[PDB]
């Protein structure tokens, strides 16, 4: 009945309206090496993060899960300052970024020592139950991710460690999938290893526009997240994301099938980029103009209500699902 | 006449006896994410590093080049504290780790933005001429590395940026080669982009055991470094490295061939590992039993003198070559 937040344990019944995937700070691994030209401006960053939090609060949001991975600039103390300033509950994660073009050598080195999976498991337990770094702050979720079209051997170490930690703690697992792939594979692999489907959120499911893919994932009993609202088409340099229009189409088909108790919604904003600032060129910026923490509320919700979605169903997704997810 | 150290500019004539590649601190990229169970032990680390510096001083060493890359735990403030304490000159680097399993998310994102190569140049220039972070410390070398059998695209950006920065500043370039490949190609590539061979050290050359490969590299006018004495066979569990007896055989062929003015020697020790402590299994710990900062002086040099290597040849390598390398 409690969940760990950056301000300590909070009753799950008090989380209220929740955004399941948003980043106050985020940096792509490697940002740390660009410290000279890409210094962290903590005061200015706290201001921007506090403003983002207040914009969420504008729409009744009481809780945010910020699943920034350990190698992507996760900063629990900074998050505590945001929470203390705004009264928002913020839940952070323990986890590493997916492999990408290739695995970082640290845990690859330890795999060759034969201890990597055990070390990762130990990291998860420490961070879920003892405290992160120089603080007593505990993570409330394990963050996993897989690559496009495969869960790599590197990534599987974290999946196995997460299932183990999940069994010991009852902690929630949040994932990120790359380019609308591996949703069924993620669920199947975690479930093979004894993870509880009612404690799993398969992320970035909005990146696939085929409801049959969503149904194949939903059949495992897991939650899914349409968590990149506002990231449209070629707006971000990485991939080609779907449009919001396509997300909404996909979502409405699932809500019409009555899957509302398995779906959560978010934007995956990055409110402060770590490392050196950058700009997007004119036409793509236009594609990203709605990528902000209010978008779901001021744009997506009214579209859904005009399409016949009731407040009961919306509140199931924003309130009921997070409460169930984080409950025993 | 001057080189930037962690204690500011120092006359090159005062560097004296030098180790061209040793790490006080090092961690594999990713170590930062394992901070909870792999804390930086500030007290113990300074003790172990200061001691390492004392051991080097005891065999006459006055200067150490510590080329720990930016993404591998480079900490110029900490190195300054070691220098302020022991009087040892420490020269640090600006650069990133090699690909090899895949480019890190950060400069890969920037590569997609199209600004990466320029950002890297800008970083080099800033860290060579202005200061690293808030430390006021300037790097005295640019550190580059390439992958096995190939200089990749990610890698070439750093090579071209280094050539460019070397032209502006006259800074020294130190490289690392992976598993005895690409020595000639590194040299060729840098020179093709305007770099000065008298300011380049091609490293880990001891990883190759074919003197033809060395001669091909030496033909470009660059320095080469046998800089991994003590790292034997499969001891570092990732890769296969030569034995020291293979290094000596190779080195003797080159010394017989009168190459002393282009050769430097080192151990590439890691005196404090960043991230979580670990233990090498007992077969590999044996292979590595000589990997420490005194190995050259108590074991390798004696062996060389017994095969007729003269004091003035050794002094050319440890004293004259660094002096020439850092001189305009
Ligand atoms: Co993600
Ligand atoms: Co995210
Ligand atoms: Co190296
Ligand atoms: Co090294």
UniProtKB/TrEMBL annotation, chains A, B:
EC number assigned by the record: 3.5.-.-
Cofactor: a divalent metal cation
Binding residues for Fe(3+) 2: 143, 176, 204
Sites where the protein binds Zn(2+) 2: 143, 176, 204
Positions annotated to bind Mn(2+): 143, 176, 204, 268
MF (Gene Ontology): hydrolase activity; zinc ion binding
Class in the EC hierarchy, top level: hydrolase
Cofactor note: Binds 2 divalent metal cations per subunit.
Pfam families tied to this protein: PTE
KW Repeat (keyword) present: no
CDD domains assigned: PTE
Binding positions for Fe(3+) 1 per the UniProt entry: 21, 23, 143, 268
PROSITE patterns the record matches: PHOSPHOTRIESTERASE_2 (PS51347)
InterPro entries per the UniProt record, alphabetical: Metal_Hydrolase (IPR032466), Phosphotriesterase (IPR001559)
Location of N6-carboxylysine modifications: 143
Keywords: Hydrolase, Metal-binding, Zinc
Binding residues annotated for Zn(2+) 1, in chain numbering: 21, 23, 143, 268
Signal peptide positions (record): none
Homology family: Belongs to the metallo-dependent hydrolases superfamily. Phosphotriesterase family.
Name of the protein this chain belongs to: Phosphotriesterase
The species this protein was found in: Geobacillus kaustophilus (strain HTA426)
């Amino acid at each position: 009945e409690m969940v760990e937040t950056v301000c300590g344990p909070v009753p799950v019944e008090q989380l209220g309206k929740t955004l399941i995937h948003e980043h106050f700070l985020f940096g792509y691994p490697g940002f740390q090496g660009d410290v000279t030209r890409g210094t962290f401006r903590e005061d200015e960053s706290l201001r921007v993060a506090v403003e983002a939090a207040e914009k969420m609060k504008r729409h009744g949001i009481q809780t945010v899960v910020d699943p920034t991975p350990n190698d992507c600039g996760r900063n629990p103390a900074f998050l505590r300052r945001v929470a203390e300033e705004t009264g928002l509950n913020i839940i952070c994660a323990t986890g590493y970024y997916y492999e990408g073009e290739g695995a970082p050598p640290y845990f690859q080195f330890r795999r060759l020592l034969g201890t990597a999976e055990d070390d990762i498991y130990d990291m998860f337990m420490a961070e879920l139950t003892e405290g992160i770094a120089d603080t007593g702050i505990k993570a409330g979720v394990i963050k996993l991710a897989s690559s496009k079209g495969r869960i790599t051997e590197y990534e599987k170490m974290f999946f196995r460690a997460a299932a183990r930690a999940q069994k010991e703690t009852g902690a929630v697992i949040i994932t990120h999938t790359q380019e609308g792939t591996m949703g069924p594979e993620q669920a199947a692999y975690l479930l093979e290893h004894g993870a509880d489907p009612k404690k799993i959120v398969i992320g970035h499911m909005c990146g696939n526009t085929d409801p049959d893919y969503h149904r194949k994932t939903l059949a495992y009993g897991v939650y899914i997240a349409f968590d990149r609202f506002g990231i449209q088409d070629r707006g971000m340099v990485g991939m080609i994301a779907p449009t919001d229009e396509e997300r909404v189409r996909t979502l409405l088909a699932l809500l019409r099938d009555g899957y509302e108790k398995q779906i959560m919604l978010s934007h995956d904003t990055v409110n402060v980029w770590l490392g050196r600032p950058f700009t997007l060129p004119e036409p793509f910026a236009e594609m990203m103009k709605n990528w902000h923490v209010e978008h779901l509320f001021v744009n997506i919700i009214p579209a859904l209500k005009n399409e016949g979605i009731r407040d009961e169903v919306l509140e199931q997704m924003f309130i009921g699902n997070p409460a169930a997810l984080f409950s025993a």
